[PDB]
Amino acid sequence: SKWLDGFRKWYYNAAGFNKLGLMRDDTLHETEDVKEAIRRLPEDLYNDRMFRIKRALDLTMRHQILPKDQWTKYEEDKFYLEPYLKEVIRERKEREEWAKK
Amino acid sequence: MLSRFLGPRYRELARNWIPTAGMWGTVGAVGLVWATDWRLILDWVPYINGKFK
Amino acid sequence: MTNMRKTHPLFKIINHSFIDLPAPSNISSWWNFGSLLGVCLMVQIITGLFLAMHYTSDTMTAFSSVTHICRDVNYGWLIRYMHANGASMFFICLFLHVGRGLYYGSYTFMETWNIGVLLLFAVMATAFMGYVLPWGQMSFWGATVITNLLSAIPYIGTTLVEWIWGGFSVDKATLTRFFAFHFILPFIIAALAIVHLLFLHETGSNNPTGLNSDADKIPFHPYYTIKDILGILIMFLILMTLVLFFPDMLGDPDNYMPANPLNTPPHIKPEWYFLFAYAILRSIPNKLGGVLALILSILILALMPFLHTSKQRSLMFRPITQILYWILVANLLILTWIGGQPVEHPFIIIGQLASISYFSIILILMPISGIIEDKMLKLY
Amino acid sequence: EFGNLARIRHVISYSLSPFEQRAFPSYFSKGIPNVLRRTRERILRVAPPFVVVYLIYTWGNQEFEQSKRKNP
Amino acid sequence: SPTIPSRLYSLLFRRTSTFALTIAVGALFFERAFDQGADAIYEHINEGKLWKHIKHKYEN
Amino acid sequence: TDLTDYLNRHYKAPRMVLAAAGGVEHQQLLDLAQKHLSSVSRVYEEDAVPGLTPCRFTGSEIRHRDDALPLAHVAIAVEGPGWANPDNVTLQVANAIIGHYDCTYGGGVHLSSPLASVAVANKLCQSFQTFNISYSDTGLLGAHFVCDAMSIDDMVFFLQGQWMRLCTSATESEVTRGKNILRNALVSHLDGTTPVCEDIGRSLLTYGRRIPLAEWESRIQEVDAQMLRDICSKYFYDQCPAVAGYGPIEQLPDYNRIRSGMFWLRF
Ligand SMILES: CCCCCCCCCCCCCCCCCC(=O)OC[C@H](COP(=O)(O)OCCN)OC(=O)CCCCCCCCCCCCCCCCC
Ligand code: HEM
Ligand code: HEM
Fold this sequence. Notes:
Chain A is mainly alpha-helical. Helices cover 58% and strands 0% of the residues of chain A. Chain A has helices at residues 2-15, 32-39, 43-61, 82-99. Chain A is globular. By secondary structure, chain B is mainly alpha-helical. Chain E: This is Cytochrome b-c1 complex subunit 9.
């Protein structure tokens, strides 16, 4: 119910990347599937991701965080890499099941 | 130094580099005297010679 | 004209490695530690060279040669206690370096990780034989204990141990070959560390966030050069206050007696960087099983790349696995404390629970926690 | 391999000379709150394992000194 | 009339060779003065315990 | 209203020069200027003094990373002495030693400037050019080069070396060559009524007088190698520069390497 959503929001605040201005989809460790998902991104989302990662590195260098108004909220955390990543995993699974037969 | 350094530009370059080379030789001399702790130079100083070093 | 730094065939390697190497801007002080290890390594070699200039590997004249180094050689006490305390500080930097690699997900560099595990085995063997070398009571009896548990191996253990010994017990053949092996092993460690740095530089280094650091990268010079000089000077501070103020807080008093095969000490233990391994060994009531558990403890440290079941590399944004990690670190501290204790109540049950929790946290609970946060962040 | 590590568009960085700026600009006044901020972020993940194993160490030492007593 | 770091830089620190020369000169002055001060402090901690404090009742 | 305020504050007779060049007699020009430009409202209406405070030079760097641009432009400059400093003339000779280069130059390897020769030998830069922009008591003295990304750091190194060469090893041959280049450029620039009129207006606004060309010849003539390396060590050696970059400027280094390039450990 709503308790699980509130507890997920508490864990999202406890994770800490939102205090660096990051999103969830920026925190993915880039494997080959994630690399192809980034390669399929539009240029504006790619530039936004590069600036967000650069700002997070600049903040982690100084051991500081953004002010609390500039934290990434749980509501507008748009999941932008999920459809590209889903099609990449689907195509890789298609190649896998072809090669297994 | 066969023939191509026999020129006035190279002599004035060497004359420009005399004080830097002399200062670096002075640096090497003072560093050698301090590091090997030579008695024959450090006996004619006002302050270091109190330790005999 | 040309650029002599980038075009000289020898200076190109130093330029690519320590001058114009692209490095992450946001790496913390833990990234100093491995460089400190290399510095500590050569420090050991330098001190060891001078300790090789007055030591005689012979059971009649080993302890007397060590006392001659301590008393008659000019500042020989300083170089000897620098060698011993720098071995201890080398293991301090080793555990902090490996803990950095475990926490920040640096074990995804698989070839670098396995090469490092090989370096870890080599430095542990080097320190064990070096501790045997001064031929005190604890040196002789620790060598006896380690070779007996090596002799616990079925059907090849006895032959292997009498071939390692060069005889039917620990004698001067063992002492001389341990001197030769303890001499030669750090150069193998140095070449292996060159391979370690080669694999890292062809794969790049990692930031504490675990993200792609190619957006913000800086040259190694002059940032991390001066940062490593500061780390080297702090490491020298701790090493010098250990060698000049408390020379024997980590040492063993029973090592200051001459070696006697007739007299056994009331308590036999190795040094503090072997104590958690000894406590893991002492818990299992099977000597073959105990040696199996020791080797597989270091091998599941090597096997840690294959247990990564999370989409996030570092533990910066993974607090449950952070909690499990600090339980693991505290469990390692507990095993270190138990390893210096005798087999009395209540140390057996505490050591058994500690080893069980150590293997369970490394093998079972960490991928389970990774899957739990993967579900909990709607990742899958 | 500078110049081909990544591709970044529309990012402007401003930096000062080290000789035009202070080495320790408001050192304690903005160093102490950041230290307690990092402390507040990390002690609830770091400290209770060490508290628990200090308790185990004290209990084990107490049981070892009690187990060597005379009675009974 | 500038500050003493200004003329110190303009006469001592502007050229690298005289920079190293003053590093060496200050190094030998510093080693002499620092050994003097350190033996003075270590002497001041330990009255009546060192050998140089008691080598008159026995030297003769 | 703000434009009217700007006109009332800035369009005044003590900040205005009427310059003429060519077939103009001074008497007819003076009569027409007295007939037409007699009333300019030179009174300070607001009774507030407009001054010119000195500007603070800042050693800093700005970098605009944008990797889609085909070429990178980098400008590195230090603080200039000003309009009224005579040492500017010496600095002009220094720029004439460094010179400039473009990819469409017909010379090739045998250019006199070592930077242009090494740039065409190693195929480093698309172009470079030196500049000495001057303002009241201040200015920008430096270089600007456009090149591809893969050459940038190398070009910077060579440029810095040239600057340090002028601080340390300026010989009389390139000093004479720079003097001749400055003579030819500074005389042949004033060819036509428009650059002569521009020189008259800018000279009366900046120096307070029109400097005669023989005075420029006498000021160029006194420049030898010793005072040229003295002025170069004054203005280039161990200074904190300002760097501006635009384009694929990833291999353009940090400020610390460029700051370390302004001095030689061997000197
Ligand atoms: C509340 C503050 C009161 C005091 C005010 C003063 C300020 C203090 C700091 C305030 C911090 C405010 C919150 C910001 C920090 C981030 C959140 C946080 O740390 O929360 C506390 C944490 C909650 O857990 P979290 O990791 O967030 O998520 C888990 C999923 N529910 O909780 C924890 O991590 C708790 C961990 C408990 C671990 C207990 C372990 C027990 C067993 C140990 C065995 C070890 C030894 C085994 C040996 C075996 C052999 C003998
Ligand atoms: C090739 C380089 C090395 C040489 C030549 C060398 C040589 C020696 C010698 C001669 C001794 C006996 C002297 C004595 O302890 O009284 C010794 C002891 C020792 N060495 Fe090394 N060593 C080297 C490298 C290392 C390294 C890399 C380590 C591990 C960090 C190490 C750890 C030890 C230890 C723990 C001891 C025992 C110190 C003690 O008496 O308590 N050595 N070494
Ligand atoms: C024997 C002494 C060792 C030396 C001299 C050594 C040397 C180094 C050096 C110089 C670095 C690069 C600097 C850094 O990032 O820390 C490094 C990184 C690394 N080492 Fe080691 N190392 C040693 C032991 C080990 C061991 C035992 C492991 C395996 C657990 C290991 C695994 C790694 C990894 C994974 C990295 C990359 C971490 C990163 O850059 O993010 N090293 N080491």
